[PDB]
Design an enzyme around this catalytic site. Structure first.
Site, PDB file in Angstrom:
ATOM      1  N   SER A 146      25.250  44.432  32.114  1.00  0.00           N
ATOM      2  CA  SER A 146      24.653  43.576  31.102  1.00  0.00           C
ATOM      3  C   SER A 146      23.134  43.513  31.263  1.00  0.00           C
ATOM      4  CB  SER A 146      25.236  42.169  31.173  1.00  0.00           C
ATOM      5  OG  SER A 146      25.411  41.757  32.518  1.00  0.00           O
ATOM      6  N   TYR A 170      36.171  38.676  24.318  1.00  0.00           N
ATOM      7  CA  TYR A 170      35.563  39.781  25.051  1.00  0.00           C
ATOM      8  C   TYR A 170      36.457  41.014  25.029  1.00  0.00           C
ATOM      9  CZ  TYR A 170      31.599  37.143  26.853  1.00  0.00           C
ATOM     10  OH  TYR A 170      30.424  36.439  26.972  1.00  0.00           O
ATOM     11  N   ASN A 200      35.140  44.557  24.023  1.00  0.00           N
ATOM     12  CA  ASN A 200      35.196  45.601  25.043  1.00  0.00           C
ATOM     13  C   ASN A 200      36.012  46.800  24.573  1.00  0.00           C
ATOM     14  OD1 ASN A 200      33.644  44.012  26.702  1.00  0.00           O
ATOM     15  ND2 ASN A 200      35.307  43.447  28.100  1.00  0.00           N
ATOM     16  N   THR A 233      23.271  39.368  37.955  1.00  0.00           N
ATOM     17  CA  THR A 233      23.718  40.587  38.625  1.00  0.00           C
ATOM     18  C   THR A 233      23.385  41.822  37.794  1.00  0.00           C
ATOM     19  OG1 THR A 233      25.532  39.321  39.621  1.00  0.00           O
ATOM     20  CG2 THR A 233      25.670  41.728  39.727  1.00  0.00           C
ATOM     21  N   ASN A 263      25.573  43.218  21.285  1.00  0.00           N
ATOM     22  CA  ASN A 263      26.794  42.429  21.164  1.00  0.00           C
ATOM     23  C   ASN A 263      26.921  41.763  19.799  1.00  0.00           C
ATOM     24  OD1 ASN A 263      28.237  42.904  23.468  1.00  0.00           O
ATOM     25  ND2 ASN A 263      27.850  40.907  24.420  1.00  0.00           N
ATOM     26  N   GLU A 305      22.072  67.802  29.500  1.00  0.00           N
ATOM     27  CA  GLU A 305      22.004  68.099  28.072  1.00  0.00           C
ATOM     28  C   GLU A 305      21.736  66.849  27.242  1.00  0.00           C
ATOM     29  OE1 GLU A 305      25.241  70.656  26.991  1.00  0.00           O
ATOM     30  OE2 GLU A 305      24.640  70.719  24.881  1.00  0.00           O
ATOM     31  N   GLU A 320      18.296  34.948  29.077  1.00  0.00           N
ATOM     32  CA  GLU A 320      18.697  36.338  28.880  1.00  0.00           C
ATOM     33  C   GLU A 320      17.565  37.231  28.377  1.00  0.00           C
ATOM     34  OE1 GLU A 320      23.238  35.017  27.681  1.00  0.00           O
ATOM     35  OE2 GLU A 320      22.534  36.996  27.051  1.00  0.00           O
ATOM     36  N   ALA A 343      24.588  35.751  41.136  1.00  0.00           N
ATOM     37  CA  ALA A 343      23.152  35.699  40.889  1.00  0.00           C
ATOM     38  C   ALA A 343      22.744  34.547  39.982  1.00  0.00           C
ATOM     39  CB  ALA A 343      22.669  37.016  40.282  1.00  0.00           C
TER      40      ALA A 343
HETATM   41  N1  LIG Z   1      30.313  43.265  25.367  1.00  0.00           N
HETATM   42  C1  LIG Z   1      30.495  42.582  26.492  1.00  0.00           C
HETATM   43  N2  LIG Z   1      29.498  41.745  26.944  1.00  0.00           N
HETATM   44  C2  LIG Z   1      29.665  41.042  28.087  1.00  0.00           C
HETATM   45  C3  LIG Z   1      30.840  41.158  28.818  1.00  0.00           C
HETATM   46  N3  LIG Z   1      30.737  40.351  29.896  1.00  0.00           N
HETATM   47  C4  LIG Z   1      29.531  39.740  29.865  1.00  0.00           C
HETATM   48  N4  LIG Z   1      28.857  40.152  28.746  1.00  0.00           N
HETATM   49  C5  LIG Z   1      27.502  39.738  28.338  1.00  0.00           C
HETATM   50  O1  LIG Z   1      26.647  39.936  29.441  1.00  0.00           O
HETATM   51  C6  LIG Z   1      25.680  38.913  29.532  1.00  0.00           C
HETATM   52  C7  LIG Z   1      25.567  38.459  30.982  1.00  0.00           C
HETATM   53  O2  LIG Z   1      26.810  38.075  31.533  1.00  0.00           O
HETATM   54  P1  LIG Z   1      27.411  38.832  32.824  1.00  0.00           P
HETATM   55  O3  LIG Z   1      27.391  40.328  32.628  1.00  0.00           O
HETATM   56  O4  LIG Z   1      28.813  38.336  33.085  1.00  0.00           O
HETATM   57  O5  LIG Z   1      26.452  38.413  34.052  1.00  0.00           O
HETATM   58  P2  LIG Z   1      26.599  39.140  35.484  1.00  0.00           P
HETATM   59  O6  LIG Z   1      26.243  40.596  35.318  1.00  0.00           O
HETATM   60  O7  LIG Z   1      27.986  38.980  36.061  1.00  0.00           O
HETATM   61  O8  LIG Z   1      25.489  38.455  36.427  1.00  0.00           O
HETATM   62  P3  LIG Z   1      25.741  37.040  37.152  1.00  0.00           P
HETATM   63  O9  LIG Z   1      27.032  36.428  36.666  1.00  0.00           O
HETATM   64  O10 LIG Z   1      24.579  36.136  36.816  1.00  0.00           O
HETATM   65  O11 LIG Z   1      25.811  37.234  38.648  1.00  0.00           O
HETATM   66  C8  LIG Z   1      26.123  37.795  28.601  1.00  0.00           C
HETATM   67  O12 LIG Z   1      25.159  37.636  27.589  1.00  0.00           O
HETATM   68  C9  LIG Z   1      27.428  38.261  27.990  1.00  0.00           C
HETATM   69  O13 LIG Z   1      27.385  38.103  26.590  1.00  0.00           O
HETATM   70  C10 LIG Z   1      31.852  41.998  28.369  1.00  0.00           C
HETATM   71  O14 LIG Z   1      32.897  42.103  29.009  1.00  0.00           O
HETATM   72  N5  LIG Z   1      31.674  42.710  27.200  1.00  0.00           N
END
Ligand SMILES: Nc1nc2c(ncn2[C@@H]2O[C@H](COP(=O)(O)OP(=O)(O)OP(=O)(O)O)[C@@H](O)[C@H]2O)c(=O)[nH]1
Ligand SMILES: Nc1nc2c(ncn2[C@@H]2O[C@H](COP(=O)(O)OP(=O)(O)O)[C@@H](O)[C@H]2O)c(=O)[nH]1
Ligand SMILES: [Mg+2]
Ligand SMILES: [Mg+2]
EC number: 3.6.5.-
Lengths: 244, 424, 247, 423
Positions: free
Chosen positions: D131, D215, D219, D136, D197, D245, D174, D90
């Site tokens: 996210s 990450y 995570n 996505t 985060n 609940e 974002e 996306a």
């Molecule tokens: N805590 C945490 N945050 C994450 C992780 N992966 C991505 N993010 C956060 O999620 C946000 C968006 O990144 P992604 O979730 O990878 O984006 P996506 O959902 O794959 O969507 P697209 O790549 O655009 O298709 C970013 O600001 C990252 O900081 C993760 O594994 N853990």
């Protein structure tokens, strides 16, 4: 232009498995819910049914079975509303098999006097009439004007009145109305005009004044003479206020 | 979003293009025969992006350029079918490249482009290297772009266009050709790195102390900048991974997609780099306008977005600190109404020669200075109507020049608008 | 230079197109057997796809003046023409990025539309192009479809029900298309159908299926529309209609 | 009572890995699916061959992340039909996740969900991991949530959102993606746990003693706190035993369904009391969303203890905080803190920087101070949308520009909704 061009929808796939036993069940609420579901969930939403290659004469003959014979007046009401929906959303389908499968049952059930139920049965009979013109109804509506129940007489005669106001068959002359006018229609409407009950007679008085309006107050002046001078001025009363 | 199809057009196109392939073939550990002799997995992790053997198409109206490439060092590796070359040259006439001679050949090129794209798992977009003052690189390039744009509208278009300067070629029709091409790129490409020959000479002359820079000297600065900006694309990494994501975080308004690239440290052709820079030193090559590949002063404008790529083993903690520092100690130079507009990324594999390095991709409104220079030269030429019979003879209309003139000035005005904008 | 209209060099074809354009204005109205760009319409069908943007535009304006020099009797052979000609015109004329190359292609289709008895033989040929890769083509050919209606309209169309269905079918996908222009220019085509039928019909089959924000803008667009539900007079007439008005 | 988990975008997918890694350790399940040892079958199904398969779907508009799942340590755990990937991502654009790319795969995704729901008898609802800033994560999820409210409308749906933070942020837009999905997913979500985060970053730097967390660091910490919330559903506790609940206890207003989660203790791997850990639940440093509950009114508050805990120690620690701190409540709320305990110890990962602790607690509290988090997004949003920056990307992928404003007004209305409750 006719809005009917909309794509057709199919409802056979909508039916559930526990339907045939539920509608043919002894518990009234089973039958009610069965009909009420396929009506509110399956029929009421749609606005055009599938003309091509869809046999509803299995479903419609079980709506007839309940409208005629089912003892639950509520199950009748919701069934005649289903029958109307089929005839309304699927225009030009009820040629013979469909139209005739529910016609004579509906005429039997005009006996019902509950306002809500007479509302639904008559409105359904109006549906089959508007889409079966004068195919089988004209002959069979007369048959049930001759019927013993007082209510079916006044209602099946009101039915001929409803249909006659929307009579606009094609051609100059020699329609089905004229082939059987004096022989059958008039001889049968006089049986209503000369009934024992006043409310019955009063329906005939309209159903004769709506007849003269269609086919000339001069053509029928022969049986007009044979009628009481007292009944004559009631018939004329409606003739002045009746349109087509 | 995996594969990228590469194209190079015109003399400069095939020159800096081949130079780019020389650099990144080494970095990935590929020899001129096309065999892996590397020693790391981070190298072949995303080799499928630019390679299959390069996914490269070589184009020029000048047929001699064919041999200048194959007789080069890595000239053996390119697919013979992907050579598509005309009989005669364009001769610095954009119209010949865009309407007449370049148009006759452009179909044959699209056939090879199709062939390379056909066997791609999932295409990202395209990549064109060319010069703007020429006839083939500018005229046929911009025509190829539009022809691809309409045949592949689901993909990114990314160009490495080099700006002409009197300091590198005294041909006076270059303002015409470059202006006409900028009129194309602002409408046809998602992102464009502006390589200014004015700035490449001023860097080779003033910073590198070379009295007469050659093409090779200027081409050295380009190939290293290209490998720097394409570091994210060629190695595993979280930030600015693919072409579309890059443009999404770099281009806030579709017409304002002209990046001012710059990188550090500036080295000579094969000189000896004894003392490796520190993290704060690299950081202070950003505003340092002597490191910009475009001849503009960032002090004279404001940054809309910035992407930094630090290459080498170093403290991620220190880089974050230095970048967070330099932003707020110069807060009046970064636009306020785009929060977190600067984005930094690190790659452990450095570029060959250097222990540490850092490239600074920036969408700075100061870039309007570059378009001013081209416009004033164009207008000086155009007001006296010089050399117009070349272009008009090839089917062009005089009106086209006025439209391109006005369209570039609107582009300049747009940059000035957002420069004077306020958040309040 | 009559056969040079297919010559190898572009600038000699560019002449033949100007030569022709001068001919169709300066030739006889009754017409020389030399004016045989009717019986072999593959000729101009080739010329409209010239493979040179500058000589193409000159072929279209030659077709344009050809296509108004034919406004005289006896040219009942306009059926063959629309089949042969408007697919090249839409495919590669409306498609074009050139200001003038597009404007004259649309004007050409106008003249081919009013050659016809109605709009039906025109719409059915230019409908498939809505399903093309290039957005600016579907962006444009939805604008062109929208203005063969606003100026002509549905009259003398056999079975309109079949035609309205055929053009309403893609409108959901067009209004959910990625391109801003394809969407924006689809709401205009919706209005131009509303501007000719009622709001009742569209909202039953189509308006239901669009984004809520979209059907708001369409309603806001109908208020700004003033004038009777079907327009009283068309802004443009067909050939058989204007001649009937004259006599 | 079965519950289905869904993972959207890299964030969802990669946090999913950390959670199912941690679920399999807590339930003694092997990487190959076997078990040498019910309440836990809320989450797992069973093969005829004694194999325990998760009730989970993994979705990403891009193979890279999910390809590592089906070639990783836990490649055998999932059926290959559960892991779904597209080709074009996306690209940090809500429009592409929701409109352009999402529609090409939404039906395949809904179809594979039906296959897991057909195996289930009394399905409860869905847990959703995604996210905010991702294209996505924002676009596709909000689409999938719309369609799940149709095909499964009469049941619960819970969110696990990753609130963005400049320290790991991959995109400028974002704020846009966050606002856009929160608008379209507001009506379709029953409850939603935000994860800032930045707080997870702050915690890992302070209490885990990491200079630049990865990450995996974030995570794993997140997976621990997610496990604490889902522990009640996986071991048959007393509190929060089913998905309804969660709404009953924590949601006294359909819109304001965003609880603040606080977790103690986070002990580096290089014991505390029940009272000490309960005081840390009212310390902002250990929250998952950065705000100040002292500036807000509590609508509800639950305490989920797990481990070596004496129920009387809890009541002492409660009375201490109820007397020696001033936790302001709203007048139309039960002034009593709900509690539940699960005597099993908090499992950590072998090798993890997080240490095994004797006891632990996760406080879920729907405070009005979490509106501060919405204000930070809305403000960032306002700055960029004031100049219509980056808007053409969204509009060019099937999205109407007005949708920006309709989302912002829905966020402004939500900020007023938080204010009126707390006055
Ligand atoms: N805590 C945490 N945050 C994450 C992780 N992966 C991505 N993010 C956060 O999620 C946000 C968006 O990144 P992604 O979730 O990878 O984006 P996506 O959902 O794959 O969507 P697209 O790549 O655009 O298709 C970013 O600001 C990252 O900081 C993760 O594994 N853990
Ligand atoms: N940096 C760089 N610029 C070049 C090179 N060759 C030509 N140029 C520039 O490109 C312009 C000439 O265009 P050119 O590419 O040679 O013409 P083409 O072959 O028709 O595309 C002038 O402004 C030159 O300064 C090169 O090798 N390196
Ligand atoms: Mg050359
Ligand atoms: Mg992703």
């Amino acid at each position: 232009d006719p809005f009917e061009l909309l794509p057709p929808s199919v409802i056979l796939d909508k039916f559930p498995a526990d339907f045939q036993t539920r509608i043919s069940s002894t518990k009234w609420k089973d039958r009610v819910e069965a009909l009420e579901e396929i009506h509110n969930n399956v029929l009421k939403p749609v606005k055009k049914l599938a003309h091509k290659n869809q046999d509803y004469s299995d479903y419609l003959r079980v709506l007839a079975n309940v409208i005629q014979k089912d003892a639950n007046v509520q199950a009748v009401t919701i069934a005649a509303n289903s029958v109307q929906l089929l005839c309304n959303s699927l225009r030009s389908n009820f040629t013979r098999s469909y139209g005739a499968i529910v016609l004579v049952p509906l005429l039997e059930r005009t006996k019902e006097k509950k306002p809500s139920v007479n509302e639904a049965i008559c409105s359904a009979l109006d549906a089959v009439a508007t889409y079966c013109g004068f195919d089988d109804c004209l002959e069979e509506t007369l048959n049930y004007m001759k019927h013993k129940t007082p209510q079916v007489r006044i209602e099946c005669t009101k039915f001929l009145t409803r249909m006659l106001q929307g009579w606009k068959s094609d051609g100059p002359l020699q329609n089905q109305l004229l082939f059987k006018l004096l022989p059958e229609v008039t001889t049968a409407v006089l049986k209503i005009v000369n009934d024992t009950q006043p409310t019955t007679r009063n329906t005939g008085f309209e159903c004769f004044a709506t007849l003269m309006k269609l086919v000339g107050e001069r053509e029928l002046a022969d049986p007009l003479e044979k009628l009481d001078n007292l009944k004559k001025k009631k018939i004329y009363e409606y003739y002045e206020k009746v349109e087509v | 979003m995996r594969e990228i199809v590469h194209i190079q057009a015109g003399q400069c196109g095939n020159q800096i293009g081949a130079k780019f392939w020389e650099v990144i073939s080494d970095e990935h550990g590929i020899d001129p025969t096309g065999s892996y002799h590397g020693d790391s997995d981070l190298q072949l992790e995303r080799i499928n992006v630019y390679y299959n053997v390069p996914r490269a198409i070589l184009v020029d109206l000048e047929p001699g350029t064919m041999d200048s490439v194959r007789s080069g060092p890595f000239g053996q590796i390119f697919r013979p079918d992907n050579f598509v070359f005309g009989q005669s040259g364009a001769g610095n006439n954009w119209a010949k490249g865009h309407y007449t001679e370049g148009a006759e050949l452009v179909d044959s090129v699209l056939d090879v482009v199709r062939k390379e794209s056909e066997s791609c798992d999932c295409l990202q977009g395209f990549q064109l290297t060319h010069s703007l003052g020429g006839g083939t690189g500018s005229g046929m390039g911009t025509l190829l772009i539009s022809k691809i744009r309409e045949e592949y509208p689901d993909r990114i278009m990314n160009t490495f266009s080099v700006v002409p300067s009197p300091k590198v070629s005294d041909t006076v029709v270059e303002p015409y050709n470059a202006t006409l091409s900028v009129h194309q790129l602002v409408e046809n490409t998602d992102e464009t790195y502006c390589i200014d020959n004015e700035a490449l000479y001023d860097i080779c002359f003033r910073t590198l102390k070379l009295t007469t820079p050659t093409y090779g000297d200027l081409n050295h600065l380009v190939s290293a900048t290209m490998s720097g900006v394409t570091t994210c694309l060629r190695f595993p990494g979280q930030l600015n991974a693919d072409l579309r994501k890059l443009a999404v975080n770099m281009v806030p308004f579709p017409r304002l997609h002209f990046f001012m690239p710059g990188f550090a440290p500036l080295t000579s052709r094969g000189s000896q780099q004894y003392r490796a820079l520190t993290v704060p030193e690299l950081t202070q090559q950003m505003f340092d306008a002597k490191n910009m590949m475009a001849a503009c002063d960032p002090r004279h404008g404001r940054y809309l977005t910035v992407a930094a790529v630090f290459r080498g083993r170093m403290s991620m903690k220190e880089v974050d600190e230095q970048m967070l520092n330099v932003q707020n100690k110069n807060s009046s130079y970064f636009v306020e109404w785009i929060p977190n507009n600067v984005k930094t990324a690190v790659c452990d594999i450095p570029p060959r020669g250097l222990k540490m390095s850092a490239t600074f991709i920036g969408n700075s409104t100061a870039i309007q200075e570059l378009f001013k220079r081209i416009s004033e030269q164009f207008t000086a030429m155009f007001r006296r109507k010089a050399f117009l019979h070349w272009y008009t003879g090839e089917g062009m209309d005089e009106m086209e020049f006025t439209e391109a003139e006005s369209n570039m000035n609107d582009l300049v005005s747009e940059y000035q608008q957002y420069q004077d904008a306020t958040a309040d | 230079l009559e056969q040079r209209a297919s010559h190898k060099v572009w600038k000699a074809r560019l002449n033949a197109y100007q030569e022709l354009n001068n001919l169709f204005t300066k030739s006889s109205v009754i017409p020389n057997d030399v004016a045989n760009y009717w019986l072999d319409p593959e000729l101009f069908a080739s010329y409209i796809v010239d493979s040179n943007v500058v000589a193409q535009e000159n072929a279209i304006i030659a077709l344009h003046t050809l296509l108004e020099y034919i406004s005289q009797v006896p040219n009942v052979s306009t059926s063959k023409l629309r089949l042969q000609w408007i697919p090249p015109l839409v495919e590669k004329g409306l498609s074009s990025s050139r200001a003038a190359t597009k404007a004259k292609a649309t004007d050409c289709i106008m003249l081919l539309t009013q050659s016809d008895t109605s709009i039906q033989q025109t719409v059915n040929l230019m409908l498939p192009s809505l399903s093309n890769k290039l957005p600016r083509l579907v962006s444009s050919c939805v604008k062109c479809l929208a203005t063969i209606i606003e100026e002509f309209g549905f009259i003398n169309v056999s079975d309109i029900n079949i035609l309205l269905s055929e053009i309403l079918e893609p409108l959901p996908k067009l209004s959910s298309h990625a391109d801003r222009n394809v969407r924006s220019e689809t709401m205009n085509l919706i209005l131009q159908i509303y501007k000719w039928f009622g709001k009742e019909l569209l909202q039953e089959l189509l308006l239901e299926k669009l984004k809520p924000i979209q059907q708001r803008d369409l309603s806001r667009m109908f208020e700004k529309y003033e004038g009777t539900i079907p327009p009283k007079q068309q802004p443009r007439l067909f050939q058989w209609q204007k001649e009937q008005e004259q006599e | 009572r079965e519950c289905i988990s869904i993972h959207v975008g890299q964030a969802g997918v990669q946090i999913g890995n950390a959670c199912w890694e941690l679920y399999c350790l807590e339930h003694g399940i092997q990487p190959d699916g076997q078990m040498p040892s019910d309440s836990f079958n809320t989450f797992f199904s069973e093969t005829g061959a004694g194999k325990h398969v998760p009730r989970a779907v993994f979705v990403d508009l891009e193979p890279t992340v999910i390809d590592e799942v089906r070639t990783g340590t836990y490649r055998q755990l999932f059926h290959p039909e559960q892991l779904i990937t597209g080709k074009e991502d996306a690209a940090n654009n809500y429009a592409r996740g929701h409109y352009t790319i999402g529609k090409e795969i939404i039906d395949l995704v809904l179809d594979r969900i039906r296959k897991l729901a057909d195996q289930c008898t009394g399905l409860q609802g869905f847990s959703v991991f995604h996210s905010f800033g991702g294209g996505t994560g924002s676009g596709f999820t909000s689409l999938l949530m719309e369609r799940l409210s149709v095909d499964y409308g009469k049941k619960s749906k819970l969110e696990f959102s990753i609130y963005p933070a400049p320290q790991v942020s991959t995109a400028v837009v974002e704020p846009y993606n966050s606002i856009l999905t929160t608008h379209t997913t507001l009506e379709h979500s029953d409850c939603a746990f935000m994860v800032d985060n930045e707080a997870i970053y702050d915690i890992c730097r302070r209490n885990l003693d990491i200079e630049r967390p990865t990450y995996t660091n974030l995570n794993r910490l997140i997976g621990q706190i997610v496990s604490s919330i889902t522990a009640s559903l996986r071991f048959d506790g007393a509190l929060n035993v089913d998905l309804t609940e969660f709404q009953t206890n924590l949601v006294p207003y359909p819109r304001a369904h965003f609880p603040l989660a606080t977790y103690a203790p986070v002990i580096s791997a290089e014991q505390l009391s029940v009272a000490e850990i309960t005081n840390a639940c009212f310390e902002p440093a250990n929250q998952m969303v950065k705000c100040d509950p002292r500036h807000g009114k509590y609508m509800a508050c639950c305490l989920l203890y797990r481990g070596d805990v004496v129920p009387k120690d809890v009541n002492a620690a409660i009375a201490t905080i109820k007397t020696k701190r001033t936790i302001q409540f709203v007048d139309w709320c039960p002034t009593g803190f709900k509690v539940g305990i699960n005597y099993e110890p908090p499992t950590v990962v072998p090798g993890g920087d997080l240490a095994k602790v004797q006891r632990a607690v996760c406080m879920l509290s729907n405070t009005t101070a979490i509106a501060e988090a919405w204000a930070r997004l809305d403000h960032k949003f306002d700055l960029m949308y004031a100049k219509r920056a980056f808007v053409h990307w969204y509009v060019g992928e099937g999205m109407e520009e007005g949708e920006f404003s309709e989302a912002r007004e829905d966020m402004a209305a939500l900020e007023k909704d938080y204010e009126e409750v707390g006055v």
